[PDB]
Design a protein around this nucleic acid. Structure first.
Ligand code: NA
Ligand code: NA
Length: 327
DNA sequence: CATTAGA
DNA sequence: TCTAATG
């Protein structure tokens, strides 16, 4: 956690570069597991060889360790750290939509700068373009202040279109969080569940409303169960506009809301934790259900869930408010 | 790990 | 279809 620090840091430093800059998913896979284990290891590693003793630690890695150990630096790393190519990739990859592969491509053709990326929107796709457009606005955290207002509006239409529609801004915001990255609204409906073959219209209706009122300025991807787009709070009695924000809304079959809802709220650890626990209490949890655990090693039969509460009660737990879902 | 775009 | 990019 701190003792095995730099090591893991350099490991993942190394890993990240393999998976993007190169297409070295193995090597990339290498660095990763290794840095995972040296990560749990309780003693101050003091020689590659030492570390070596580990599973995942091969020759190459250890060798680096030794180097990193000796000198507080890495060659491959400082050389890597300097290459404007790998650099350009690291950067380019930022744009929502620009992934490594697109990244390289862009680089080879020579788009290194954001400006470059401009003169050639032509070669960019819709996503990317928007992603390029709000390059600045997308990098920004959302003041809890705007969330409310954003949320307020969401909730107002969902309701305005169909009274039956249950909306639920999850995530960090919902966890109390002061700022968040983007807005994620969980959507469901009664007329919609596990069997009852779709009703695409469901998501579609509200997407339309959010557009009608001008909350939603642009679409990333609309699909029959998950909409990905771009929203904006009305720029008030002017002198001030709102930055564009990323919003996502997904339609959930009523029978599995809460499960998603729990999950979607997080934290990451909180889940695993509750999850790791559901297991001891003879259960199983995941993005949609909670199924009793059978001794024959496995079992199923997805248990009816009324709210986040029933989930706890099942696993026999203490209702922990969203604020306290920190872990 | 599953949904969408795109080509 | 397969591949990418988002989450
Ligand atoms: Na070994
Ligand atoms: Na991106």
């Amino acid at each position: 956690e701190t003792l095995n620090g730099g090591i893991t840091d350099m490991l993942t430093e190394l890993a990240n570069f393999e998976k993007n800059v190169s297409q070295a998913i193995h090597k990339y896979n290498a660095y990763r597991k290794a840095a995972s284990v040296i990560a749990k290891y309780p003693h101050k590693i003091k020689s590659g060889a030492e570390a070596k003793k580990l599973p995942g630690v091969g020759t190459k890695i250890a060798e680096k360790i030794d180097e990193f150990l000796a000198t507080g630096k890495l060659r491959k790393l400082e050389k890597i750290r300097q290459d404007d190519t790998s650099s350009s990739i690291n950067f380019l990859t930022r744009v929502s939509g620009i992934g490594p592969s697109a990244a390289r491509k862009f680089v080879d053709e020579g788009i290194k700068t954001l400006e470059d990326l401009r003169k050639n929107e032509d070669k960019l796709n819709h996503h990317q373009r928007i992603g390029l457009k709000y390059f600045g606005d997308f990098e920004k955290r959302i003041p809890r202040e705007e969330m409310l207002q954003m949320q307020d509006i969401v909730l107002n239409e969902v309701k305005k279109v169909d009274s039956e529609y249950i909306a639920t801004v999850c995530g960090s915001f919902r966890r109390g969080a002061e700022s968040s990255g983007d807005m994620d609204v969980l959507l469901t409906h009664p007329s919609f569940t596990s069997e009852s073959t779709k009703q695409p219209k469901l998501l579609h209706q509200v997407v339309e409303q959010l557009q009608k009122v001008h909350f939603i300025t642009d679409t990333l991807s609309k699909g029959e169960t998950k909409f990905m787009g771009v929203c904006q709070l009305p720029s008030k009695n002017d002198e001030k506009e709102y930055p564009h924000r990323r919003i996502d809304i997904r339609l959930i079959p009523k029978d599995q809301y809460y499960c998603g809802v729990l999950y979607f709220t997080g934290s990451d650890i909180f889940n695993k934790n509750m999850r790791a626990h559901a297991l001891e209490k003879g259960f199983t949890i995941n993005e949609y259900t909670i199924r009793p655990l059978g001794v024959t090693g496995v079992a199923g039969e997805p248990l009816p869930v009324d709210s986040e509460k029933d989930i706890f009660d099942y696993i026999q737990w203490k209702y922990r408010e969203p604020k306290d879902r920190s872990e």
